[PDB]
Each structure stands twice: as C-alpha cells, then as structure tokens.
C-alpha cells in the first residue's frame with residue numbers, strides 16, 4: 372500500500388505532465404497521495420495563472436464576514452457577522468492596518484504558535500465565497516474555471532443527466548482569518564490555488580481516520596452534537612493541533628505559499644488560517660473514485676448548513692433514501 376503513514380505529499384509536475392488534469396490526479400493517487408487527505412502541487416516553472424495582479428482592486432466583496440470566536444483558545448466556534456460591502460483595494464488596506472496586520476514573527480512556526488494562542492481574542496474579516504476567477508482565459512493548464520464539471524462526471528459514470536453548474540470561488544483573507552474543520556459538500560474533492568499574498572496553513576485528518584475526528588468533535592461540542600448529527604457541515608468548529616495530539620487524533624499540517632495548488636481528497640477533514648492579506652481561488656471537483664464517497668456522505672438536515680442549488684441533484688441521485696429529509700432542511 373503506497374503512503375501507509377498518510378503523509379502529505381508534494382508534487383512537482385513537468386510542463387508535459389501539467390497538460391492533462393485528470394491523469395495527474397490519478398497519478399498522485401497511484402502514489403498514495405489521497406491517504407493524507409491533502410496534497411501540494413508546485414506548478415512547473417514555465418506556468419503562470421495570469422500576467423499580473425495589478426488590476427484586481429476594483430473587485431467587490433459584497434458581504435465581508437467578521438469571524439467572531441467563542442470558547443477557549445484550542446477549542447472554539449466562530450460565527451460570521453456580515454459587514455458592509457468593500458472593494459478588494461479597501462479590504463487590502465484594512466488587512467494591512469495596525470488593528471489587523473500580521474504581528475512581527477520569526478518564522479511560520481512562531482506565527483502558528485501566536486495564532487493558536489491569540490486567535491480567539493480578535494475578530495478578523497474574511498472575503499469568502501465570491502463567485503469568480505482570476506485565471507487568464509488563455510491559461511490552458513490547471514485553470515480552475517475550465518475543469519470538467521461534477522455534473523458531467525456523474526453523467527459519465529452513472530449515465531444520468533442532471534441540472535446544475537460548478538464554478539470557482541475567490542477568497543480574500545487577512546491575518547487570523549480561519550477555515551473551520553470540514554469535508555467538502557458531498558465529500559467532493561477540492562482544489563485551491565493561492566494567487567497572491569501571504570501564506571495559508573492547513574491541517575488535515577487522513578480520510579481513513581475521519582470518524583475519529585467526528586467522535587472528538589461530538590465530545591468537545593456537546594450542545595452542537597445534540598442539535599445535529601452532522602454538525603461539522605456547519606463549518607464553525609475549531610480544534611487546535613495541541614488538542615488533537617492530546618486526544619490521539621491522527622493529522623498532518625503544511626503551509627501553502629503563493630503560486631502553489633492544494634488538493635483536498637474525498638472525506639479529508641481540513642482546517643486552517645491565513646498569515647496575512649492574500650487571495651485564493653477554489654472549486655470542487657469529482658473523479659470516478661469519488662462516487663462511492665458521495666453515496667456515503669453524511670448530511671446536515673437541521674437547517675444550518677444551507678448549500679448550493681447544485682447539491683440537490685447529487686443527493687437526489689446518490690442518496691435517494693435521504694433526499695426527502697435533507698430537502699426539508701433546505702426548505
């Protein structure tokens with residue numbers, strides 16, 4: 372069995388290997404990359420996403436989200452408070468202000484320590500989930516707005532044509548902006564490209580050990596767990612590396628820098644934080660290996676998780692027994 376310790380693997384495809392996306396995902400899996408739940412892909416030196424980032428300041432962040440924490444330093448939830456619209460130029464200025472800027476630090480490890488010690492005492496503002504793309508239309512390789520769609524994959528594998536579309540999302544981050552412990556909708560893959568700015572630190576639980584994280588989460592968030600049998604779908608719970616180690620939960624960590632892709636694999640729980648002002652782009656995708664994970668994916672039916680239009684068909688076709696209850700939670 373390849374990669375039996377479930378380590379995060381880093382790949383350096385050549386320009387020729389960067390042509391066929393599906394084929395390279397399948398290569399990474401042949402080497403065991405999926406066992407970790409997350410892989411890093413460093414593009415060939417000849418590649419670029421676009422010519423420059425000099426003209427992005429007029430993008431609008433219609434609903435910036437202030438991420439307010441409750442709990443203790445290593446075990447907390449966050450809620451998202453909606454703020455007034457602002458442009459990317461305005462947001463960048465805010466991120467760099469004395470109230471929000473990254474503190475002085477020695478290295479990534481020192482910054483990680485400061486994150487876990489101090490995150491709860493501040494409420495950073497995240498421009499998340501903005502439909503759109505920063506890839507140039509002329510970038511033909513690993514362009515996140517030109518991937519094969521999940522609807523076409525389901526049709527190819529299963530023969531059923533379904534409604535729905537699949538487009539990318541932009542994330543503008545600042546120091547301490549946080550992504551809570553989650554898997555993707557319907558336990559899909561995700562791919563994330565860090566276009567510019569400061570790094571993003573990731574933590575991940577191997578898919579084969581996801582239920583260990585869920586069991587801890589139920590213990591640590593007992594009110595939430597009573598409210599919903601899949602409350603990590605709400606994307607609000609954080610657990611530090613120190614707490615995971617104390618409870619014996621297998622995980623790994625890695626820092627993504629500008630110009631690098633990360634791929635999350637089906638049922639790979641992940642969480643993390645941004646080091647300072649940055650912009651990432653991400654999208655879900657599927658492969659043939661996903662189908663069995665989509666059929667088994669947990670679902671939130673309590674009403675909180677509220678998701679895209681396009682998840683309807685996935686539940687309807689892959690999980691017909693669950694469909695009626697899940698849709699009640701949508702309505």
Ligand SMILES: O=C(O)CNC(=O)C(=O)O
Nearest residue numbers: 542550561562563635653
């Ligand atoms: O970048 C973020 O805030 C969150 N991204 C992801 O969870 C992802 O790409 O799967």
Ligand SMILES: [Mg+2]
Nearest residue numbers: 427428429430
């Ligand atoms: Mg602009």
Ligand code: NI
Nearest residue numbers: 554555561635
């Ligand atoms: Ni994700």
Ligand SMILES: [Zn+2]
Nearest residue numbers: 599671673675
């Ligand atoms: Zn729920």
